[PDB]
Amino acid sequence: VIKPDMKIKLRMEGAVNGHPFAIEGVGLGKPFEGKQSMDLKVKEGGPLPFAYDILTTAFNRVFAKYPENIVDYFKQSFPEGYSWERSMSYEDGGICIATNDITLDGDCYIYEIRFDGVNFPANGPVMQKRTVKWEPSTEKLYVRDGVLKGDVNMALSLEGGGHYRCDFKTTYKAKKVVQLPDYHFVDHHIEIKSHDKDYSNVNLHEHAEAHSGLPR
Amino acid sequence: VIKPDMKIKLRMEGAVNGHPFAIEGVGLGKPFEGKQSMDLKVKEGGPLPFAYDILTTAFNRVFAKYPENIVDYFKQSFPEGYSWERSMSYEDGGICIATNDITLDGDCYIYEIRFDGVNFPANGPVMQKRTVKWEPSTEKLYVRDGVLKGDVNMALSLEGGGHYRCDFKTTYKAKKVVQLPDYHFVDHHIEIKSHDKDYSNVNLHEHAEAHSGLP
Amino acid sequence: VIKPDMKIKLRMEGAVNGHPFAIEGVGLGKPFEGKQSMDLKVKEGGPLPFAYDILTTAFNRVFAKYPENIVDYFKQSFPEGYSWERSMSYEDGGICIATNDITLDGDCYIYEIRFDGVNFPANGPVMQKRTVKWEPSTEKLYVRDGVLKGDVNMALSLEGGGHYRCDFKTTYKAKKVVQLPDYHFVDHHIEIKSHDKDYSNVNLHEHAEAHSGLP
Amino acid sequence: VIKPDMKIKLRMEGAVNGHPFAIEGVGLGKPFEGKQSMDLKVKEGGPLPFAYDILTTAFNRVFAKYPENIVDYFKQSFPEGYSWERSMSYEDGGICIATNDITLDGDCYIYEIRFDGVNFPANGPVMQKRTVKWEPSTEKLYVRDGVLKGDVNMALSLEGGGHYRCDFKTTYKAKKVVQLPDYHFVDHHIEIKSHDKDYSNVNLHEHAEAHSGLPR
């Protein structure tokens, strides 16, 4: 049920600082190559009055290249699928939380995403749209209470230099019993490859690969 | 346009650990006495698989008794009203965030509430429904960036003793220009007065009073 | 063995952002009235390159007025005494941690204090010495694992208005078995009454009172 | 002033939950190989009533292998040296903070370390000594206010499975003006290679290598 080429359809509904928005996307990815791409359109709440970048990691670790020697929690979970829950705590007190319920219909993954954020300062980099991109990162994954956790300290690069930090904590929950992996890592890189002026239209790419870190 | 007795209608839509739910409420309160009560009904997602208590502070500081010597940000904001944004960070890593948009229709406040929480551990007191009540508390309120902030370290009492801590951070935003207050406090006390077995029906009370502290 | 008037001697050794310092103090207080004062002198590391205010809460809850209806963990612990451990997490990522070991010699409490802080930004209000005073506050106290916990969200007022928040988490540990109290509060107010230009010499006051909250 | 083989002498003084201790160490490392090792002896406060593992990352990024294409803040800082300040926030509310002032005398680095920790629960993995080792990790490094920051979400493996998380935030401060690097990573792995029963004697090794993460 996992093919080398898969399709993606998503809808995100959410709010930031109380202002509602919705986004839909269609994309495709290569589960065994750890690559995916997507075209996204703002359907409600546009033009978004906050940095689009805070949304992009919400738009599926199935699309991570896993080696033979590491248990792949995500690929095992299908056809039933899995869901995730995530908090994103920014250094200036802004906080977002999101969830994705991921199902499979034929060769198309369907994401139902909810995203909510609060307490972003009016003069902060998020509401003033001064973010440039996410730096690449390494997520740490480990088992807790029979489910899988993923943590990572991320950073947005800012216009005119400097970085803006965010601590991500994710819980991933398979919809059926699956084999549990040992502690491992997923390196990833997410990139807006193109966008129009107010980000109503966005082409988004991600590359991700699991590994076991420095040996000995 | 603020009367001694006012009505309340609310809808909350939300999710905890990805589990969607919705609650409706009707109540009434006394803005100048700092009291309010309401009846709440789970309309979707019932029976709620998490402690009801995490929701109750989301179910309006206009219902706080303010003395003459303290600027009342909330009462000033009407008829236009105000909105709030809040994060609630629990000591075991559970996080909720909520927003309320509050408007006025005649004598009736209307709340549009959104509530979301994630990362509550399966074995923790929230998902295990081991909470008893919120202890009384005191919110600290202060101005930042031309809007009003409210912070408080809250605690839930737990079944079989002990407490479970949660740090609240709220931003309040008037829909019009109002006078901004100096640093002050709001003491409050929130109580579920009655409920049925699975909390499908709940009668909720709050009492709150602003003050300027210890000399 | 607790008298209406008691003396205090302390030494604090510490470091902020890796910069070592040391302070000595002599003072006196009134355990049953919940008042205390003291004179403090920087002995090493002067002139301190950070806001003095971050240190003052480290410079003893025995000097809190407890009513009859609340168990007094602190007064019970003497003559053996008690110790405390505390973290202070500021909103800009600055972190301090402190410990005090408190003993009794005749009529004189002796404090051995250690204080350390890191990650205060160069441009932040602590390293820029832009703090004015701590606002009055209310500590929440409650039992966990047979010892007493104290939590409070504190705020420093800043020069030119605005506030700077800090979350306090303390653990208090009696040196002997004592009666454990129920959930309660300690209101307190701490003030630098006088100081010289670079805070080499400081006269510090505190007033504190326990209570059970809002009904 | 940077040699392929360098010596290390350190003293750490500190307290955990108010109980004071002191440790001294002698070791050596290979700055260009990103390898170092050390023998440590508890001089005061033994036998330590808490997990030794909380101390080990306090016992110098000079010993990280840096590629040509990444600015090496640490090697540049010598002979004058640099200092660091660090907070370590554990998921059960335990908190440690430490500082190291690092100087150079001939071919020997001298570390003066202070370490303080509080609010470790009596029944937690630290006071009950149920930690096994630190998992390998990837530190994220970036410039802020003209100094270098390093953040990483770390994890201790626990006896009988499971992990215990800790968020590290470090500030590194060169003692002279040096070139500032772009955002980068340092993968590392720290290991107690041998110890006696109560950890009075410990042989500690670390391997570390800088890189720039996933490309494109």
Automatic annotation (TrEMBL), chains B, C:
The organism's lineage? Eukaryota, Metazoa, Cnidaria, Anthozoa, Hexacorallia
> Quick one: which residues bind Cu(2+) 1?
195
Where on the tree of life does the source sit, at the highest rank?
Eukaryota
Record protein name field: Fluorescent protein Dronpa
Sites where the protein binds Cu(2+) 2: 205, 207
Record keywords: Chromophore, Luminescence, Metal-binding, Photoprotein
**GO function term, MF aspect, one:** metal ion binding
Q: Pfam families under this entry?
A: GFP
Origin organism is: Echinophyllia sp. SC22
